Symmetry: C3
Subunit: 117 residues, 3 copies
């Protein structure tokens, strides 16, 4: 899975090791191994969420198979909100998530695509 | 709606308050309330647009229902180009926009997804 | 085409001119002119790839027509991996690529969309 997190918290207010802890958290939530989790954190951005520039975070989750239905994503969302509110010290009103299904032909790995691996 | 703006203008050349003014502008253009507009600005990046590293900006707009047809997006594009050329002091050759339709099952909000709200 | 590269290499470890060389490389690989190539590089990020925070890079490629099949993307992937491993001095285990087809109605250019140009 691919997780991308944008935040207007400065880099020195994002807890050290967050990108590693989000790999473990995603592994348990999504049912994929931690060594197949990719995390990108982009701090220090200028953001408005719901029209307000108070501290906030946007998460994007992309994966094959597991983020493609309302029922699956409801479960995922509840667990990611619990993790992120506690780690970033944000309220639930200051986080949004977007889910994007991928297919094997879209993922380039080791000079090929996943369709052939 | 979700607006993401990447630019190679340094942070100290992006006008103060842009993320707030882009919420108001998007509200009028897209016909959604400003308190449902989310803006992310990422300045200071290394960019080429049309093969040239002169100052430029890329905007991504994602929303339910309103960015899914050529005719709607033609209107949207004209209004966003007018706003951004004036705010960033860029020519129309130095801005591109991408539009992405979303569905309710893809948006995680308050620990659930929008399908159930 | 649109290329976006996220990396945890600091800005002062990304080779000068990379965004320009990636335009030329993409032109040859994708068969589109260099003056229609758009590159965004975001360095200095916090990243884990395959669960590891060692230096890494994520590339996203979006285009009309040419990134929509496994067979096309296998070829593209091999050539992008050769370019990026040499430029960034990374091993092939430290790069992933995502491919995203676009349609003409999604691209805002000169105040309209590409459907009408």
């Amino acid at each position: 899975p691919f997780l991308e997190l944008d935040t207007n918290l400065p880099a020195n207010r994002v807890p050290a090791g967050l990108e590693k802890r989000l790999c473990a958290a995603a592994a348990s939530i999504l049912g994929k191994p931690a060594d197949r989790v990719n995390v990108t954190v982009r701090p220090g951005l200028a953001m408005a969420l719901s029209g307000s520039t108070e501290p906030c975070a946007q998460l994007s989750i992309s994966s094959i198979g597991v983020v493609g239905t309302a029922e699956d994503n409801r479960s995922h969302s509840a667990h990611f909100f619990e993790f992120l509110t506690k780690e970033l010290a944000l309220g639930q009103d200051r986080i949004l998530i977007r889910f994007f299904p991928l297919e094997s032909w879209q993922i380039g790995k080791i000079g090929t695509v996943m369709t052939f691996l």
